Amino acid sequence: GVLYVGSKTKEGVVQGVATVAEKTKEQVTNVGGAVVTGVTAVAQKTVEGAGSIAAATGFVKKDQ
Amino acid sequence: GVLYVGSKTKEGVVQGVATVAEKTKEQVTNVGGAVVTGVTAVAQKTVEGAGSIAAATGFVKKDQ
Amino acid sequence: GVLYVGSKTKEGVVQGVATVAEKTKEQVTNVGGAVVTGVTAVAQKTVEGAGSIAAATGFVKKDQ
Amino acid sequence: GVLYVGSKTKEGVVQGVATVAEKTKEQVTNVGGAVVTGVTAVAQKTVEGAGSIAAATGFVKKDQ
Amino acid sequence: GVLYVGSKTKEGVVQGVATVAEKTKEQVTNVGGAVVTGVTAVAQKTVEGAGSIAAATGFVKKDQ
Known part of the structure; x- marks a missing residue:
């Protein structure tokens, strides 16, 4: 149960x-x-x- | 149960x-x-x- | 159950x-x-x- | 149970x-x-x- | 039970x-x-x- 009454919220x-x-x-x-040289907003x-x-940026995954 | 009464919310x-x-x-x-050199907004x-x-940017996945 | 009464929400x-x-x-x-050098909004x-x-940008997937 | 009455919250x-x-x-x-040389906001x-x-940036994962 | 009445909170x-x-x-x-030489805000x-x-930046994980 979540109730917002007359509020302002940034999440x-x-x-x-x-x-x-x-x-x-x-x-x-x-x-x-993997090479990342830009602008990333997530x-x-x-x-x-x-x-x-x-939210993975510049990620190398090689699980065995 | 989620109730918003007269509120402003950015999620x-x-x-x-x-x-x-x-x-x-x-x-x-x-x-x-993988090479990323741009602008990415997610x-x-x-x-x-x-x-x-x-939200994966510049991601190499080679799981075995 | 989700109820919005007189609210403004950006999700x-x-x-x-x-x-x-x-x-x-x-x-x-x-x-x-994979090479990405542009503008990507998702x-x-x-x-x-x-x-x-x-939301995968510049993604190489070679799972075995 | 979470209730916001006339409040402003950034989370x-x-x-x-x-x-x-x-x-x-x-x-x-x-x-x-993995090499990251950009601007990343998550x-x-x-x-x-x-x-x-x-929120992994510049991450190499090779678990065996 | 969490209640905010007329408050301002940054979390x-x-x-x-x-x-x-x-x-x-x-x-x-x-x-x-893994090499990170940019600006990262998480x-x-x-x-x-x-x-x-x-919130892992410049992370090499090779658990066996």
Whole structure:
């Protein structure tokens, strides 16, 4: 039982992200891997689950 | 039981993302991998599931 | 049981994304992989499922 | 039982991130690994699950 | 039982992060590892789970 009366609520939010990126001559060599060089904003209220993965950035998974 | 009376609620939201990117001469060489160099905004309220993956950016999965 | 009376709610939304990208001479060489260099906005309310994948960007999956 | 009467609450939020990055000549060589050199904002209200992973950035998992 | 009457509460939030980074000639060589050189903001209200990992940055896990 959850009751909101005349309230304001922010749950799991990204409000404001501002990025200025100036880059000259980048080179990326990736063999069998993961490379992230950008801007990533992830907002989630509820994630439920055994062994679950939520908000993974630059992730290499090789479970045996 | 969930009841909202005269309320304002933001749940799982990305509001404002502003990016300026100036790049001269990038080269990307990727063999059997994942490379992310952009802008990614992901907003999700509810994700449910065993072994579930939600909001994966630049992800290499090779489970055996 | 979910009841909204005179309320305002935002659930799983991306509101505003603004990107300026100036790029001279990019070259992308990709062999058997995934490369993402754009702008990606994903908004989802509810995703349910075992082993489910939601909002995957730049994802290489080779499970055996 | 959770009741909010005339209240303002922020739960699991990233409000404001501002980054200025000037980079000349970066080169990234990655073999079977994970490299993250960007801007990552992750906001989540509730994550529940055995062995769960939430908000992983630059993560290499090779469990046997 | 949790009751908020006319209150203001911030729980699990990152408010303001400002970074200026000027870098000339960085090179990153990573073999079977994890390297993080960016800006990472993670805000989470509640994470529950045995053996759970939340807010891992630059993490190598090879449990046997």
